Amino acid sequence: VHMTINERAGMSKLVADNIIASVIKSNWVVDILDIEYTAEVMTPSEGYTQHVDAESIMTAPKGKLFHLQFMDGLLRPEPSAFDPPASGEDMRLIYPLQP
């Protein structure tokens, strides 16, 4: 499903959690048009000074400005040839809807 969410307000917590669970276990894509946010664009060395739970994005007040951070991972040098293999997967949920 590509579930658009025009209005977050009145969404049940069991339902917000259920949608996010569907995002993971069933690969839903979930646009949430009600969010207004400012985006700081962090460089790879400064990492992610801020961290956000899915619960907060599904339950921010409708007028408040969220402050998302996004990596510009372009300035990130190749791994040493002998570094141990990364078994597990880096995973990512949140994306911008426009540039």
């Binding site: 307000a9 009145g10 007040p61 409708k62 007028g63």
Partner: protein
């Protein structure tokens, strides 16, 4: 020339809703939404919890 009118401000109706909850299914915790939308919608969503 006359005290014709008591001047109340946030008037009380002659009728109100009154609710009996089934305590087993009722959640004791107060419901919460956006703060403004709770300011309006809130007394209602609590009365008909």
């Amino acid at each position: 020339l006359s005290d014709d009118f008591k001047q109340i401000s946030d008037p009380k109706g002659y009728l109100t809703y009154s609710v009996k909850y089934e305590d087993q299914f009722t959640k004791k915790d107060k419901l919460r939404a956006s703060e403004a939308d709770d300011r309006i919608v809130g007394p209602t969503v609590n009365l008909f919890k």
